[PDB]
DNA sequence: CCGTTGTT
DNA sequence: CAACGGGCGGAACTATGCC
RNA sequence: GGCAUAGUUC
């Protein structure tokens, strides 16, 4: 169930839509803007 | 005297004029209830207020 | 304030 | 002996500024 | 719509 190099993360989850919902004008939360820069580096 | 029957309340009555005042706290401002109402977004729960 | 971990 | 980290009440009601 | 701050009741 907990292999040790599993601790070392090489693919990150990204939670639905749900966790991160829109906001009503739409606003992207916490977690959307930091998903969008981690996204950002990781393609450059 | 006694309002209902007319006979003399057998203790006197300490009566006189006082100040009092009406604080702001009404009740017409305080009721609530609910029974199926609006729900929050994110954890859809009933809302708060 | 006081449970962990390091340094000595 | 020293440094570091987590822990610290319960509900409720208005208002105002800002993204 | 949300975040923050202030005041008030018990």
Partial sequence: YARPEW???????????SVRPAVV??????????????????NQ | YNGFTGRKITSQI????TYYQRLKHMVDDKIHSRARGPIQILNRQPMEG
């Fill in chain 1, 7 to 17: 601790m070392i993360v090489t693919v990150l989850p990204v939670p639905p839509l």
């Fill in chain 1, 25 to 42: 004008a739409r606003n992207q939360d916490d977690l959307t803007h930091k998903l969008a820069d981690i996204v950002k580096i990781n």
């Fill in chain 2, 14 to 17: 300490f009566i006189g004029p």
